[PDB]
């Protein structure tokens, strides 16, 4: 069963791979295959209009119709950067679904700037997946604005620390009706299993896969842990686990 | 599917051991051993005891017990003396030489010094031992020197579902010890199993987490998957934690 549907596009894979830093077509093919992924992410730097790999750049390598193509605003240090990136993605590439990011000084999401940016892009009809620090009011505001799903920070980007406040994430997931994706600081498979045991619908990983000694093994490990965590969650664990 | 332990001709491959010895429901044992993907049968069979003989015969036409390595246990014994006597009877009555060795204080915690004494005495008679200890390096080293096959190491209190109380201590112990380590005690859900494997554990022994889950079958299945994901993740060389 899909855990998210946007238009005709169905999200099934429980692992999302941040590929926007990749430059190698065969590596992107392999990591996405090993993760069992069904989403392809493309970014754009608004200041020079350089893009990351397009979905079509893997036409020879992947069954493109099995991949939902979405954009991301990963160079945004401000609300204005993000909108500019978002509009380039829509107009030039025809991307309607956006992995929305607005990052503060220390590469942590700016919750206020993200909400503001999200409201402006919703007015234009873009389907959104914003990234936030786990704050209940910020999350409810984004759900009310019509965001398809939220991405909530586990720990800082590239830290591999896993899930810093599981209680806060579980609470948020319990009260928000739309799917939650756990993201940021995921280091290994156990962190993925943990996220699913909190009720997360999926996990997004990036650094874990670039910095593992064997990226494709870690990707396959994470795919498997997501299933394990999901089965664990469905099994109704003994109460003192929660 | 590499064996992580071999004793004589008997190979241990499954990464989940199920501590079934207190279960008296045949359906439960069957379903849990099947769904966990277990290959070790921890047995209390007593061939002139009517009750245990009937339970075994009941189980034997629903599970292929020939696919399992059979191992005895001393977990029902409360003193060291009783554990030694259980083990000798087990060998003489059944011809089983592999032993889940448990010597506990009245607080249901392994008694390290008593376990070591019992281990040396049973090793002098050529028994093959899997003792349970609190994570202590000197104890672990004495047990390796005595020639124990594998070490079961306590993660947290029995039946507590608290997971791994001190991961650093268990990781260090695994680094220093040349025999396989099985993490055991207080395992609550699939994420704890994944965690154990990422510390370098060769396997995990679970009991209460299955018995007390709303669906024991799903949790057993989830744990099989988590053990395999955790292994692959360990073998992939995860990024270090910042
Ligand atoms: Ca790059
Ligand atoms: Ca590039
Ligand atoms: Ca929810
Ligand atoms: Ca008897
Ligand atoms: Ca039967
Ligand atoms: Ca050895």
């Amino acid at each position: 069963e899909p855990w998210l549907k946007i238009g005709a596009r169905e999200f099934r894979s429980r692992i999302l791979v941040g590929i926007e830093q990749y430059d190698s077509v065969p590596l992107v093919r392999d990591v996405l295959n090993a993760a069992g992924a069904d989403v392809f992410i493309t970014t754009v730097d608004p200041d020079n209009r350089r893009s990351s790999l397009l979905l079509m750049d893997l036409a020879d390598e992947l069954p493109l119709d099995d991949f939902t193509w979405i954009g991301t605003t990963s160079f945004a240090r401000t609300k204005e950067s993000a909108l500019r990136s978002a509009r380039i993605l829509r107009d030039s590439l025809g991307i309607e679904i956006l992995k929305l990011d607005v990052r503060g000084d220390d590469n942590t999401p700016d919750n206020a700037g993200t909400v503001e940016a999200a409201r402006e892009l919703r007015a234009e009809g873009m389907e959104l997946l914003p990234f936030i620090l786990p704050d209940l009011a910020t999350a409810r505001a984004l759900e009310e604005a019509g965001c398809a799903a939220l991405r909530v920070m586990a720990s800082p980007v590239a830290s591999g620390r896993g899930i810093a406040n599981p209680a806060a994430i579980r609470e948020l997931i319990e009260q928000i009706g739309i799917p939650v994706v756990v993201e940021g600081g995921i280091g290994s498979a156990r962190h993925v299993a943990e996220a699913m045991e909190l009720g997360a619908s999926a996990t997004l990983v990036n650094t874990a896969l670039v910095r593992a000694e064997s990226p494709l093994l870690m990707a396959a490990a994470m795919r498997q842990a997501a299933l394990a965590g999901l089965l664990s969650y469905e099994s109704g664990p003994m109460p003192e686990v929660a």
Side-chain angles (χ1 to χ4, degrees), chain A residues 2-115 117-242:
Chain A
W3 53 271
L4 179 61
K5 191 170 196 194
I6 306 173
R9 303 308 305 173
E10 296 179 316
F11 292 68
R12 279 189 163 79
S13 308
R14 307 294 186 150
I15 303 292
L16 292 137
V17 184
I19 60 164
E20 57 258 56
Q21 301 169 316
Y22 290 39
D23 289 287
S24 165
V25 171
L27 181 58
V28 168
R29 171 200 63 216
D30 289 335
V31 179
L32 290 171
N33 282 331
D38 64 6
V39 171
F40 189 101
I41 299 168
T42 296
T43 197
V44 185
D45 176 353
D47 296 4
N48 56 38
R49 294 162 168 276
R50 294 182 69 261
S51 51
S52 69
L53 289 168
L54 309 177
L55 176 74
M56 274 303 298
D57 291 328
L58 277 90
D60 295 330
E61 303 305 317
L62 294 169
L64 300 189
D65 295 327
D66 297 333
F67 282 87
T68 295
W69 192 21
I70 81 180
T72 188
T73 63
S74 285
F75 290 81
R77 278 217 252 283
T78 63
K79 187 220 298 179
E80 283 80 23
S81 312
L83 300 193
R84 221 153 62 241
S85 318
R87 292 162 181 165
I88 292 161
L89 289 157
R90 187 173 210 171
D91 299 348
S92 307
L93 305 176
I95 283 163
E96 291 297 325
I97 307 165
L98 197 71
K99 160 174 127 75
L100 174 58
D101 295 287
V102 179
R103 302 279 174 92
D105 282 23
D106 47 340
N107 207 14
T108 46
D110 178 344
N111 284 12
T114 301
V115 172
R119 277 166 177 157
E120 298 230 60
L121 295 168
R122 281 297 317 126
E124 303 180 24
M126 289 202 88
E127 302 309 320
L128 300 182
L129 295 93
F131 190 27
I132 54 161
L133 291 172
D135 180 68
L136 197 51
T138 303
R140 277 198 274 257
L142 292 163
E143 183 176 24
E144 269 163 34
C147 292
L150 312 182
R151 293 147 51 222
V152 177
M153 174 161 271
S155 60
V157 171
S159 76
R161 286 166 167 152
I163 312 197
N165 193 345
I169 308 270
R170 192 195 314 105
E171 182 179 276
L172 186 151
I173 288 165
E174 285 170 351
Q175 283 175 66
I176 274 61
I178 53 169
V180 172
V181 178
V182 173
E183 179 175 340
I186 301 295
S188 61
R190 84 184 154 91
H191 296 151
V192 170
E194 184 180 359
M196 304 303 292
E197 287 187 8
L198 302 176
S201 303
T203 305
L204 190 146
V205 298
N206 183 354
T207 306
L209 300 190
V210 314
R211 297 200 179 187
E213 293 181 17
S214 174
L216 306 186
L217 274 190
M218 182 55 92
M222 283 175 165
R223 179 184 186 173
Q224 224 68 36
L227 181 75
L230 189 63
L231 284 178
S232 188
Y233 184 71
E234 306 251 38
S235 80
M238 62 189 290
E240 37 276 280
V241 173

